[PDB]
């Protein structure tokens, strides 16, 4: 009875982590593309570009970890016992 | 097979070692190099 639920929880946590990884990796990559281009064109702008960057990143990474948290909820404290 | 994401007392030992190196450098490398520059 419980082993099927354990397999389901493991596959669900894997899906959560995979989605979080895809989203976070690609979003950070796009934001960093913007940052590297802006700093390559104008070096002195580096500082004033960290303010939008770490806002965007701050959102993106948020998703990942939020998902990370929920992955734990699936795998360590399975919502169905 | 044990959960390797659980910290041991090792956490402190390593800390101490780092807390030694950070001193040594912080006293014996960065001030002389900064003075040389």
């Amino acid at each position: 009875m419980d082993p099927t639920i354990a397999a389901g929880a493991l596959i669900g946590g894997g899906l959560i982590m995979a989605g979080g990884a895809i989203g976070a990796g690609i979003g950070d990559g796009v934001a960093g593309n913007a940052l590297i281009s802006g700093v390559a064109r104008q070096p002195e702008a580096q500082g004033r570009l960290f303010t939008p960057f770490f806002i965007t990143v701050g959102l993106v990474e948020a998703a990942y970890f939020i998902n990370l948290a929920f992955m734990a909820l699936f795998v360590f404290a399975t919502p169905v016992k | 097979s044990s959960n390797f994401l659980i910290p041991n007392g090792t956490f402190f030992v390593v800390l101490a070692i780092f807390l030694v190196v950070l001193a040594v450098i912080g006293t014996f490398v960065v001030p002389p190099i900064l003075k040389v520059l």
Binding site: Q46, G47, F50, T51, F54, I55, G58, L59, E61, A62, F65, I66 | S1, S2, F4, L5, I6, P7, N8, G9, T10, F11, F12, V13, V14, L15, I17, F18, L19, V20, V21, L22, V24, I25, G26, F28, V29, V30, P32, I33, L34, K35, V36, L37
Partner: protein, 237 residues
């Protein structure tokens, strides 16, 4: 076949401390200290400098340019020694893993006289949590015991106050698992590459080792850069 990071261990103060990752981080500490003393005896501002002086000069100038662009060397003279020691410590500790220290077995499978230190959650957690407490107390000293928490909760956009909170929880975690997972990966690979037969085991081992040198350098650099950036974010205004 492959088995994951079990540790030769012993109880030192009622707390189970690993033999490995205390031997290896100690060797890294002694190597950094030996390099430091060798510089203490050979640092010359008068004539041409040697090799160790040039190495530490490069590291110090790079990290000082970083601290100057980020927060300012007039406001934060300690971030420079912190960044330098973080870089050199992590770099030496990760580069010690290149050594031919794998020696198959007494019985069964692969084994090493020295596991890399960053392949342990205690090592990376010590580094990340020390940096965490340091930049939070630097933010407190720069802004106040009551102004620094409200600034962490406000951020650059106050309406995003929950998201900002998540950021503050995610900075240590990231810093510690980007390096664990990374160096940890290396471990597993050299253990599964040791399942090949000897005549066809040298090529993947050499490719992985040669690229793990660059990976360890880049990981030390990322840890130090992000430490400097976190200090500049916690001490702003």
């Amino acid at each position: 076949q492959i088995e994951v990071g079990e540790h030769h261990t012993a109880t030192w103060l009622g707390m189970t401390v690993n033999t490995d990752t205390v031997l290896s981080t100690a060797i890294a500490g002694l190597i950094v200290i030996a390099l430091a003393f060798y510089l203490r005896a050979k640092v010359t501002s008068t004539d041409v400098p040697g090799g160790v002086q040039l190495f530490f000069e490069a590291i110090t100038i790079q990290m000082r340019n970083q601290v100057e662009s980020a927060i300012g060397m007039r406001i934060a003279p300690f971030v420079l020694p912190l960044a330098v020691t973080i870089f050199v410590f992590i770099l030496i500790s990760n580069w010690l893993a290149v050594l031919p220290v794998q020696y198959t077995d007494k019985h069964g499978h692969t084994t090493e006289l020295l596991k890399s230190a960053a392949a342990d959650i205690n090592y990376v957690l010590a580094l990340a949590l020390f940096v965490f407490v340091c930049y939070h107390t630097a933010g407190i000293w720069r802004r106040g015991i009551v102004g620094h928490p409200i600034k962490l909760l406000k951020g650059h956009v106050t309406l995003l106050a929950p998201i900002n909170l998540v950021e503050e929880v995610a900075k240590p975690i990231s810093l510690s698992l980007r390096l664990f997972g990374n160096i940890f990966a290396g471990g597993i690979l050299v253990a599964l590459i040791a399942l090949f037969p000897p005549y066809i085991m040298w090529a993947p081992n050499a490719i992985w080792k040669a690229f793990d040198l660059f990976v360890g350098a880049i990981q030390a650099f990322i840890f130090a850069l992000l430490t400097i950036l976190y200090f500049s974010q916690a001490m702003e205004l």
